[PDB]
Description:
105 residues, five-stranded mixed β-sheet, oxidoreductase, S-nitrosation
Amino acid sequence: MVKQIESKTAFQEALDAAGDKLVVVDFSATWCGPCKMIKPFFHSLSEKYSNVIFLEVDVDDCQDVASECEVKCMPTFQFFKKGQKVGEFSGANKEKLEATINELV
């Protein structure tokens, strides 16, 4: 349901392969409690919204992607359409996360 991105090549190829589908990216880290908090809910969205692609990026695994995508906070959710960033927020905010998906899809 949630596909783990483990290189910048994989990241770029996921955005390409998404076509016109919304892509939602959870940028997370293991020292991040709230990131761990919200992981089950992020999984739930990926089971509820099968019309949307859900990716996880661990900032330590993927420092290049984190840096290139201008991530500064943990967790950060970023939203893409056709390879372009259309939204982003920080924090383990479940309502904000689903309310953003619903604005964008």
